[PDB]
Amino acid sequence: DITLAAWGRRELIIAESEMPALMGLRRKYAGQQPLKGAKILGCIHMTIQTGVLIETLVALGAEVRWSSCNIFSTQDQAAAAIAAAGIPVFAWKGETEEEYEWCIEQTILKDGQPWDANMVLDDGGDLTEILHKKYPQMLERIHGITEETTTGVHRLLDMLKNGTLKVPAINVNDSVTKSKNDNKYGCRHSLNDAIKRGTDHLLSGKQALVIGYGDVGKGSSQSLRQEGMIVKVAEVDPICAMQACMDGFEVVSPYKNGINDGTEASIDAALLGKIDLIVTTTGNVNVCDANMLKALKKRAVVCNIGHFDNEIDTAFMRKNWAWEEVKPQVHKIHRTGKDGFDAHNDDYLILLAEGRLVNLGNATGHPSRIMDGSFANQVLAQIHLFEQKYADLPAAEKAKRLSVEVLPKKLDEEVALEMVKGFGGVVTQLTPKQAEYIGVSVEGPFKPDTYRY
Amino acid sequence: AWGRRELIIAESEMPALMGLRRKYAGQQPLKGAKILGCIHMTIQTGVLIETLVALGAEVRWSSCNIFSTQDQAAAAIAAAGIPVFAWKGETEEEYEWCIEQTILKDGQPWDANMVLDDGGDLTEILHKKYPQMLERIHGITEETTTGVHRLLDMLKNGTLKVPAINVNDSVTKSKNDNKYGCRHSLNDAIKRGTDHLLSGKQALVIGYGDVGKGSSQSLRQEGMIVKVAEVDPICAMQACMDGFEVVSPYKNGINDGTEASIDAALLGKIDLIVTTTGNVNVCDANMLKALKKRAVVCNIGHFDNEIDTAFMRKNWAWEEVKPQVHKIHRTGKDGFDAHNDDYLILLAEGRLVNLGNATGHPSRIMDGSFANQVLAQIHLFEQKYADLPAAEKAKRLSVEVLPKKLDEEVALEMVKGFGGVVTQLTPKQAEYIGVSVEGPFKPDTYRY
Amino acid sequence: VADITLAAWGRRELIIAESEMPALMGLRRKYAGQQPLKGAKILGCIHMTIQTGVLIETLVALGAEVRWSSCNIFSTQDQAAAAIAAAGIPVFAWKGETEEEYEWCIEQTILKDGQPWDANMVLDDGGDLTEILHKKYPQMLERIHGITEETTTGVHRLLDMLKNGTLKVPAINVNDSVTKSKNDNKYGCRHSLNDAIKRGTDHLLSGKQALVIGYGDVGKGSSQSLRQEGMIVKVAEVDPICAMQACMDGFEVVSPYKNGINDGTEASIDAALLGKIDLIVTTTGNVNVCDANMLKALKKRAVVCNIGHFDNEIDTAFMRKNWAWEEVKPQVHKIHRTGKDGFDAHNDDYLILLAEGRLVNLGNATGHPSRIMDGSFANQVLAQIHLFEQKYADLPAAEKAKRLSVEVLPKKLDEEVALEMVKGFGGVVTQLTPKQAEYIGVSVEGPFKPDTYRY
Amino acid sequence: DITLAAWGRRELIIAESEMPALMGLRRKYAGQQPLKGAKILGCIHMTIQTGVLIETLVALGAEVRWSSCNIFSTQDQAAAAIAAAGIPVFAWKGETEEEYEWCIEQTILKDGQPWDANMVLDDGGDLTEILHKKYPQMLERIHGITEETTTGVHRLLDMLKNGTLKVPAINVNDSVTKSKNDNKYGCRHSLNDAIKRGTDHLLSGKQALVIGYGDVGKGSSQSLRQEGMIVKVAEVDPICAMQACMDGFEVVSPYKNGINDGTEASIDAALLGKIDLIVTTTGNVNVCDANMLKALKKRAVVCNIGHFDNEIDTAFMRKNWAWEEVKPQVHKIHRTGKDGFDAHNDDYLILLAEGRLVNLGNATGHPSRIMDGSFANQVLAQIHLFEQKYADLPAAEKAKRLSVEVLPKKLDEEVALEMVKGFGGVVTQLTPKQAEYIGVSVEGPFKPDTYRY
Ligand SMILES: NC(=O)c1ccc[n+]([C@@H]2O[C@H](COP(=O)([O-])OP(=O)(O)OC[C@H]3O[C@@H](n4cnc5c(N)ncnc54)[C@H](O)[C@@H]3O)[C@@H](O)[C@H]2O)c1
Ligand SMILES: NC(=O)c1ccc[n+]([C@@H]2O[C@H](COP(=O)([O-])OP(=O)(O)OC[C@H]3O[C@@H](n4cnc5c(N)ncnc54)[C@H](O)[C@@H]3O)[C@@H](O)[C@H]2O)c1
Ligand SMILES: NC(=O)c1ccc[n+]([C@@H]2O[C@H](COP(=O)([O-])OP(=O)(O)OC[C@H]3O[C@@H](n4cnc5c(N)ncnc54)[C@H](O)[C@@H]3O)[C@@H](O)[C@H]2O)c1
Ligand SMILES: NC(=O)c1ccc[n+]([C@@H]2O[C@H](COP(=O)([O-])OP(=O)(O)OC[C@H]3O[C@@H](n4cnc5c(N)ncnc54)[C@H](O)[C@@H]3O)[C@@H](O)[C@H]2O)c1
Ligand SMILES: Nc1ncnc2c1ncn2[C@@H]1O[C@H](CO)[C@@H](O)[C@H]1O
Ligand SMILES: Nc1ncnc2c1ncn2[C@@H]1O[C@H](CO)[C@@H](O)[C@H]1O
Ligand SMILES: [K+]
Ligand SMILES: [K+]
């Protein structure tokens, strides 16, 4: 379908007014054109907030090839707007696992020849793995790697220890305006909006359980508390559990004594018989096991917010229990049956997004004003690695240039200022008598690298 | 009489210390530790300094930070026969007499191994005046910020070959005091000092650090329309996200000193100004004389130079209602008839809240403060310094911050105190993230 | 009517919905066998939706027969009526939308072939049935026991009609009830406003500045929705008492006019306050509460929404000839404030409106969630049983002049609905002890509070 | 040490700007002198803000005598300010009840002869019953009685039902400035202050129980939630218990299945072993029983914001459990020991506000700016009753003139407008065209008499 081209154009115009920090590059850095001949490829979710990134990159003179990393992430009006520039590009939502690979494989080929790529944009680390294992000759003129999310970073870390890593990498996720802006406040806007779009229930007075208290979990739990639920949290890391205790929640283990023995007798079935909704944030293997999932209340909602679907055991339910569909990203799953179910039965569960990313699945995603801070960091990081020309310096210099890297604080503050001025806010200036007092210039970093904010 | 009663309570609202004690009892991993302690006596350290010496340990204590010394803890200790006074002497001449009768009891010096210095002032004399004793030490524990700068630069300058460990950078130390300590204490104190209605009016808070983050919620949760001022763009970014309004006392924020630079329109509509930063002259005198009538002035930022009190004293007169609350009148240096319109009010002295209205935070907040240092001590005594050869030490030299493992063991007992429970991992699951069932779950770059 | 085979989808659509109405189901289960409504004959005219079908299916389960239609023109969901019609109850709600059918539907509802029907109860949804019953078929008024109405506009008509003597059989209104008013007004918009905003514009709602005109019972719910998301909001009002509550709840009270008076000249507008507001919400029923001069002073790229009923609460007539209109999505619009004759797409000074003075909650939403609509329909089921026990119609002509009166819903029947809604959340209420009740002076069965208690 | 009266006056003299309506009362009726030396007797727990009313009454030309209502609310330093103004007072904190009742009868009799009285102020009906069972020849002289609180309205209605009530009264709880303003926000502002001032504990992450969800219940719950607590709500009325679910609170019952029958096995020992703070807000005879506190967890803290001490079975705690006083307002209650104890026990109890009322027993109490409207209507009701002089009416007409009435609309609207202007708000004036259309006068009653506000 091609109708959505005009609709996305109006949304982008309103989106541009909502991203003052990223739009500043189109006026300041459009003069010297820092990026010339930087052939790169990208992979993160495609929303209207992603469209302006490709727009500015094309405007500055760079060219990209792009793809989505999750099945239920694509916004059909955002993808059509980028295709309106005449590029033949294919991307959509709701495809099988085999079709998901077929799009990535089309990205890195041009009718027979691999792309002459120099840098990458990869979240999760999927496309990272294919290029190392399947096409060893792709990484021959690569300068760096730009990674957005946490799951990718762990993919990068172990590959340094084994020596398979061959090029330096930058971790944009560590910037303060990414993890303290996108992970925390991004999910708070989107979670409860996505939930109410699917079930269309009244959230006031119900009970919910959230697993994990990381940066995503904080915003998710706030997004549910601000609607009127009663929320409880579980955690393995005592620091996060302490934060949960001091933020006004209750902490509990879904297994007896907090020890997952493996048998059904170790499940605290009493407490799980009073829970109406489950959200999983951990991004780990099997944090919602099949033995747990058979002890929940009738007509209970299950959803996942982590990047991968290893959090809930959807494999067991497909082999034992029956499935029926209500609407996209909504399912009904009866118990004690495989061949069929009674039409008037009341013993069933309901699943959202099939255990995948729910807020991009059942909703639009994070607002345009939040991704502004997460994208200027990426664009600045792209420059900071291009001029170094890692493909050209001699191997005698390569052995010392391969080290951990991250953007400095001044480049982050130059984005934070333009974001703050977008709201109509004002930032004061220090007199010289005060600037010399604290050891910080009138213009420069006000905090060290150890500061946690 | 009453000084013996609070000890039972003090044992009762410290879950972590008693949990560690009952975990390590029987085994007694450490016996006859030679900690020479000098941190200020407080109501929480009473048991582990008087019970042990009553059973027969017979180890003396002292107070380095005399300004923070409280007579209540000393009176609680005084119920025993230990010759300790901790009196408010405040004179050096009589103080030297007390010192000499403590180091030696039976005529011989005691084999002190570690000094508990959190001031870093006497640590550069005596023990370094003759290096004979310096060959038998274990470590050092300092808490004050910018006070360890002396240790750090006389380490880099090359006059020390001893690594130092910092207790302040611990994760549990940051959130308990910087963020969660202020949110509980500010809202109670601001109302306790004046008994006003924090609803419908407008307030102005300066800075959006950890203290500012804690203060803004303590004011906004009651219905006060709060505004924030900040020089750091990142803190202002967090200010805009939490739902606050960011403004500037100066026209476009440029402080020229002339009267035509102050935006006097806003200052006449604002009902409160409070300072949370640590910078100098943040409350300027030019905007001080252009506030709305009958505003309240507050300060918590540990610095007395934030508000221009000198200009205020030389131009405006005070009224001493009591030594705990001060009123100030803007009519002139004297001559108020009975009650006028032009006046302001000050909390305690303008300097600190800790002048006597309230001390610190409730014991549950300060549970972790003393918990980290005792684990730092237990870690050092597990291994003997003289048994490690000096060869391979010089072959592998590095400086490392406190391991995350010791801090997690603090929070486990403290979460268990509230009634929660923490799930144990499975061997198959723990290999996906690359950390064992008990190992540190986060890298050192991760910001909690 | 379309396909009868598609009623199967409506069947399971009702079945899934049934899980979220505990009160209706509790009253259905408890009254089985006792049969309160045996022999009753009911007429209904409420707009046909999913929950409406629940109302019809729960009325017929207790032993009553019903005939149904729709008072409204545009409000009809064809899926739900098919299920009930297949179940075996005569239904006549469809989307004709033609003037010829409007005259045909009214007489056909009661008269089928020339022989009048033996009606005994009426449910009206605005007062249309009440008018035609007393004015055009007075011959059958002797057999009707009473009428129940849930809308205030029909209540005023009913009361004005009472004085003229045209009313002949009693009626009961339910709008003033607690479980009707608070659920329909406050919780209804608190859940829906911020959901409707975020589906329309997708804007980062936290950090921006909003204005709310009015603090009525709807206004409080609309104002609480925004403050929990992360905005800053302002309140404007004309009533001193209800304005005093906003100051205590943590707001700031302002006016769009200088000194509060409106002389009608350009100098009376406060531009120091309208220049920073990007969201304005009107929660009144009055006319022209937002004048054309406020629309010339608003900040660029602002959002306006109306939650009343009329296109006359805000000055759309001033924008109907001076400004240009452009459509963004199904129900959001752009209004460019640079002129009339043409406009480029890269304009800055435009404005954004939601549904222009019309319903915002039927255009792209399903309105109130199904749990609140439980409380509106479960109040009307108890009234019909109450009127049935009184037995007005069969009384002698002498005693018919003493029973006739207008009365509000009794407090005890009000408390019955609330009991079976708390148990839907798993809530367990406490039962009074005989020793305790006599100390307070209320019955163990209830009620517990006076009739003028301000809830 | 009476000399604290100077400090009391100095504290009192700076609270004038918080009460605009009470000031405007003088700025409107100083030129008429309505009381003209009328004799006003009353009873209420006195404070600085009641001292403002007392000094206003004295400045209006009258002379009053005043007694205390609660043991803990003497406020010797605050009462000394009025005591130095020639008005004798008889109160002493911590006094035995026999001395208090001997003091109460002291002011009734002056030189062996009953003092003159024209109006009476009352709190809780304690003085009214004394007047009705002692010197019954006193009621005929009194012209009117002004009283407050929900309980007092019930007492007056019961008296009217018995038919023995004379000298009609005026109900002030009906007015908005007293019901939905004083009752809700006074607790929300004072409860946390009092408990944190008395106990100094941390009020984040713990569990508490609040019984009843009326106006005072609707107010006291928010202060606990905003401090980070997780609290539970129970009540007997379905209507008010429904509101708790919609506000986001959780509903339980101390008894199994909701049926109480008086046996030890009928209570639910599960939830009671978790709650640590109990605030009871019903003002009844018995909301908790003897066996409720046997299942209570160790070291809980008790509270009472009702009207009487009946709501705790203090008689049960007196016969079997010994009391030993160690610290004012905070002392220990043992659970199993009698006439002796072991050296150490972990099973004692912590008490606050023994039997009597919190806040104004352990703190300053209700603040000044909130109680502007209450005292404003308190004075204006006396003015209104004075505008309907008695002892001039026809004898045959007196029988049919007696009726029950409530304060009209415009007076309360003017009081509210006075309070609005004190915060800086501006109220819009309705246009003449909008008066014709809606059908309300420009300044008259805007709400129908049945509005629930
Ligand atoms: N959808 C989005 O917009 C988005 C954004 C960022 C990150 N993510 C995803 O979120 C996930 C985690 O993000 P993060 O930055 O919050 O991670 P994080 O590392 O900061 O925190 C994860 C938490 O899980 C806890 N945990 C681990 N195993 C547990 C168990 N069995 N039970 C309870 N707690 C357990 C850890 O202690 C930790 O506190 C990743 O999969 C990442 O890709 C999604
Ligand atoms: N309350 C306590 O118990 C306690 C204990 C120790 C220290 N402190 C004090 O707390 C102070 C601040 O605490 P923190 O570490 O959370 O703050 P911080 O160190 O994180 O930063 C304070 C903020 O003030 C801002 N600031 C500086 N100059 C400013 C100016 N002219 N105008 C506006 N804003 C300005 C800075 O940008 C910064 O954001 C420290 O200076 C320290 O002395 C308090
Ligand atoms: N859309 C919905 O979901 C919904 C729900 C219930 C009711 N309603 C209807 O919409 C309206 C909602 O109002 P309500 O039920 O809360 O009644 P209400 O009478 O309590 O509200 C009237 C409010 O408007 C204020 N007001 C009146 N004229 C004003 C003016 N010129 N400027 C400023 N403030 C002014 C009054 O002070 C008062 O606060 C009613 O007409 C009601 O029938 C709509
Ligand atoms: N400072 C103070 O101490 C102070 C201040 C103001 C008011 N009050 C008290 O407030 C009370 C009035 O509150 P209100 O105005 O909300 O009146 P209210 O009658 O509406 O509230 C009392 C509530 O208790 C509930 N209830 C009755 N018996 C119960 C039981 N056994 N268990 C549980 N719930 C039960 C009722 O359903 C009702 O909701 C009075 O008792 C008065 O003494 C005290
Ligand atoms: N609207 C969005 N557009 C693009 N990426 C997004 C959006 N919302 C979240 N993400 C990214 O998705 C990743 C994992 O879900 C995160 O790194 C986050 O930055
Ligand atoms: N400090 C106070 N001063 C005056 N009235 C108060 C105070 N605290 C509570 N009240 C009132 O006392 C009554 C019951 O305590 C209520 O009407 C309440 O509003
Ligand atoms: K979005
Ligand atoms: K007081």
Q: What is the DSSP string of A106-135?
A: HHTEETTEE----EEEESTTHHHHHHHHT-
Which of C181, C253, C257 comes nearest D420 by C-beta?
C253
Q: Give the pairing of strands A207-211 and A230-234.
A: parallel
Match 């007199």 to its residue by tokens.
Answer: A431
End-to-end CA distance of chain D: 48
Q: Which CATH number fits domain B180-360: 3.40.50.10790, 1.10.3210.10, 3.60.15.10, 3.40.50.720?
A: 3.40.50.720
Query: Taking the domains of chain C in order of start, what are their residue ranges?
Result: 1-186+368-427, 187-367
Which of A204, A229, A249 comes nearest D246 by C-beta?
A204
Which H or E run includes D187? helix D182-199
Nearest to D272 by CA among D253, D250, D287: D253
Packed helices A238-246 and B404-418: angle between N→C axes, nearest 10 degrees: 40
With contact defined as beta carbons under 8 Å apart, do B325 and D14 qualify?
Answer: no
Q: Is C348 exposed, middle or buried (0-12, 13-18, 19+ CB in 10 A)?
A: exposed
Q: Whose CA is nearest to atom 2 of ligand 6?
A: D366
Q: Which residues contact B410 (CB under 8 A, 6 or more apart)?
A: A238, B16, B172, B368, B371, B372, B375
Two tokens, residue B98? 């007390």
Query: How many CB atoms lie under 10 A from the CB of residue D34?
Result: 13
**How far is B325 from A157, CA to CA, in rounded Å?**
58
Residues of chain D with C-beta less than 8 angstroms from the C-beta of A249? 205, 230
Q: Which residues contact C394 (CB under 8 A, 6 or more apart)?
A: none
Residues of chain A with C-beta less than 8 angstroms from the C-beta of D250? 205, 207, 230
With contact defined as beta carbons under 8 Å apart, do D120 and D39 qualify?
Answer: no
**How far is D453 from D435, CA to CA, in rounded Å?**
21
What is the distance, to the nearest Å, from the Cα of residue A339 to the centroid of all Cα atoms in its chain?
Answer: 38
A13 phi, psi to nearest 5 deg = -65, -45
**How far is A286 from A289, CA to CA, in rounded Å?**
6
With contact defined as beta carbons under 8 Å apart, do D274 and D209 qualify?
Answer: no
Match 């203060």 to its residue by tokens.
Answer: B215
With contact defined as beta carbons under 8 Å apart, do A7 and C329 qualify?
Answer: yes
Residue numbers of C annotated as active site:
47, 70, 75, 125, 150, 175, 180, 184-185, 189, 309, 368, 376, 380
CA D252 to chain C, closest CA, distance in angstroms equals 6
Interchain contact B243–A (C-beta under 8 A): no
* Cα distances (angstroms) measured from residue C111 to each of B383, C104, C118: 101, 11, 10
Amino acid in position D259: I
With contact defined as beta carbons under 8 Å apart, do A75 and A142 qualify?
Answer: no
Two tokens, residue C213? 């005109």
Q: Which CATH number fits domain D1-184+366-425: 3.40.50.300, 1.10.3980.10, 3.40.50.1480, 3.40.47.10?
A: 3.40.50.1480
- C285 in contact with ligand 3, CB cutoff 6 A: yes
Residues of chain B with C-beta less than 8 angstroms from the C-beta of D190? none
H helices present in C228-302, as ranges: 240-249, 271-274
Give the single-character DSSP code of D334. Answer: E
Instruction: State yes or no: cis peptide before C256, omega within 30 of 0.
Output: no
What is the distance, to the nearest Å, from the Cα of residue B305 to the centroid of all Cα atoms in its chain?
Answer: 19
B339/D18 CB distance under 8 A: no
Nearest to C147 by CA among C168, C177, C121, C128: C121
Residues C434, C440, C441, CA angle at the centre, nearest 5°? 80
Amino acid in position D72: F
Q: Is-same-fold flag (A1-184+366-425; A185-365)? A: yes
**How far is A171 from A405, CA to CA, in rounded Å?**
7
**Which ligand 4 atom sits nearest the alpha carbon of residue D307?**
43
Q: Is C146 exposed, middle or buried (0-12, 13-18, 19+ CB in 10 A)?
A: buried
Q: Which residue among A55, A121, A360, A362 has the greatest number of ligand 5 atoms within 8 angstroms of its CB, and so is best to mutate?
A: A360
Q: Is C103 exposed, middle or buried (0-12, 13-18, 19+ CB in 10 A)?
A: exposed
**How far is C256 from C235, CA to CA, in rounded Å?**
10
Resolution of the structure, angstroms: 2.9
C428/D253 CB distance under 8 A: yes
**How far is D438 from C287, CA to CA, in rounded Å?**
9
With contact defined as beta carbons under 8 Å apart, do D124 and D307 qualify?
Answer: yes
Q: Give the pairing of strands A207-211 and A277-280.
A: parallel
With contact defined as beta carbons under 8 Å apart, do D168 and D402 qualify?
Answer: yes
**Helices and strands, number each (H, E), in chain D:** 17, 15
With contact defined as beta carbons under 8 Å apart, do B215 and B276 qualify?
Answer: yes
Q: How far is the CA of C399 from the centre of ligand 7 (A)?
A: 68
Two tokens, residue B127? 């023990």
Two tokens, residue B44? 């929480």
Tell me if residue B424 falls in helix, strand or coil. coil
Rounded to a whole number of angstroms, the CA Rg of chain A reads 24
**How far is D174 from A355, CA to CA, in rounded Å?**
55
Q: Which residues contact A211 (CB under 8 A, 6 or more apart)?
A: A217, A233, A234, A254, A278, A279, A280, A281, A282, A287, A288, A311
369-388 in chain C: CB under 8 A from chain D: none
- C185 in contact with ligand 3, CB cutoff 6 A: yes
Tell me if residue C233 falls in helix, strand or coil. strand
Q: Which CATH architecture has domain B1-179+361-420?
A: 3-Layer(aba) Sandwich (3.40)
Amino acid in position A222: Q
Q: Which CATH number fits domain C187-367: 3.40.190.80, 3.40.50.720, 3.30.43.10, 3.90.1170.50?
A: 3.40.50.720
D193/B188 CB distance under 8 A: yes
Amino acid in position C17: A
State in words which class domain C1-186+368-427 has: alpha beta
With contact defined as beta carbons under 8 Å apart, do A307 and A332 qualify?
Answer: no
Q: Is D439 exposed, middle or buried (0-12, 13-18, 19+ CB in 10 A)?
A: exposed
E-strand stretches of C208-365: 209-213, 232-236, 279-282, 303-306, 324-329, 332-336, 350-353
The DSSP string of C93-150 is ------HHHHHHHHHHHH-SSSS-----EEEESSSHHHHHHHHH--TTTTT--EEEE-
What is the distance, to the nearest Å, from the Cα of residue B346 to the centroid of all Cα atoms in its chain?
Answer: 23
Q: Which CATH architecture has domain D185-365?
A: 3-Layer(aba) Sandwich (3.40)
**How far is D3 from D14, CA to CA, in rounded Å?**
19
**How far is A90 from A67, CA to CA, in rounded Å?**
9
What is the distance, to the nearest Å, from the Cα of residue A194 to the centroid of all Cα atoms in its chain?
Answer: 15
Q: How far is the CA of D146 from the centre of ligand 4 (A)?
A: 21
Largest CA distance in chain D: 82
Q: Which residues contact A132 (CB under 8 A, 6 or more apart)?
A: A139, A159, A164
* Cα distances (angstroms) measured from residue B110 to each of B36, B38, B102, B122, D293: 10, 15, 10, 18, 54
- Which residue ranges of C make up the annotated binding site? 49, 125, 150-153, 180, 184-185, 214-219, 237, 286, 307-309, 361
Two tokens, residue B422? 């923490």
Residue numbers of D annotated as active site:
45, 68, 73, 123, 148, 173, 178, 182-183, 187, 307, 366, 374, 378
H helices present in D300-442, as ranges: 314-319, 372-386, 395-401, 409-423, 432-438
Packed helices B233-241 and B210-220: angle between N→C axes, nearest 10 degrees: 30
Q: How far is the CA of B210 from the centre of ligand 2 (A)?
A: 8
- C242 in contact with ligand 3, CB cutoff 6 A: yes
**How far is C21 from B98, CA to CA, in rounded Å?**
80
Match 């709701």 to its residue by tokens.
Answer: A94
CB-based burial, A303-338: b 16+ in 10 Å, e otherwise:
bbbbbbbbbbbbeebeeebbeeeeeebbbbbbbeee
Interchain contact A236–B (C-beta under 8 A): yes
Amino acid in position B384: K
Q: Is A90 exposed, middle or buried (0-12, 13-18, 19+ CB in 10 A)?
A: exposed
Query: How many CB atoms lie under 10 A from the CB of residue B240?
Result: 23
Give the single-character DSSP code of B161. Answer: -
Q: Which long-range contacts (CB under 8 A, 24 or more apart) does D104-113 make?
A: D104/D67, D104/D130, D107/D65, D107/D67, D108/D134, D108/D135
D344/B195 CB distance under 8 A: no
Give me the sign of the Cα torsion angle B122, B123, B125, B127.
positive
Q: How many Cα atoms occupy the beta-carbon half-sphere of B175 within 13 Å?
A: 17
Amino acid in position C316: T
Give the single-character DSSP code of B178. Answer: I
C135 phi, psi to nearest 5 deg = -90, -40
Which H or E run includes A221? helix A215-225
**Is A221 among the catalytic positions?**
no
Q: How far is the CA of B341 from the centre of ligand 8 (A)?
A: 22
**How far is A361 from A352, CA to CA, in rounded Å?**
9
Nearest to B441 by CA among D289, A283, C204: A283
Rounded to a whole number of angstroms, the CA Rg of chain D reads 24
Residue C171, strand partner residues = C147, C406
Residues of chain B with C-beta less than 8 angstroms from the C-beta of A420? 233, 236-237, 240, 246
With contact defined as beta carbons under 8 Å apart, do B247 and B225 qualify?
Answer: no
* Cα distances (angstroms) measured from residue A302 to each of A216, C273, C412: 17, 46, 40
Two tokens, residue D150? 């929900």
What is the distance, to the nearest Å, from the Cα of residue D359 to the centroid of all Cα atoms in its chain?
Answer: 11
**How far is A306 from B150, CA to CA, in rounded Å?**
47
Q: Which residue among D69, D71, D122, D150 has the greatest number of ligand 4 atoms within 8 angstroms of its CB, and so is best to mutate?
A: D150
C365 phi, psi to nearest 5 deg = -130, 170
| Gaps in chain A (C to N distance exceeding 2.5 A) after | none
- Which residue ranges of B make up the annotated binding site? 42, 118, 143-146, 173, 177-178, 207-212, 230, 279, 300-302, 354
Q: Give the pairing of strands D40-43 and D119-122.
A: parallel
Experimental method reported for this structure: cryo-EM
Residue A170, strand partner residues = A146, A405
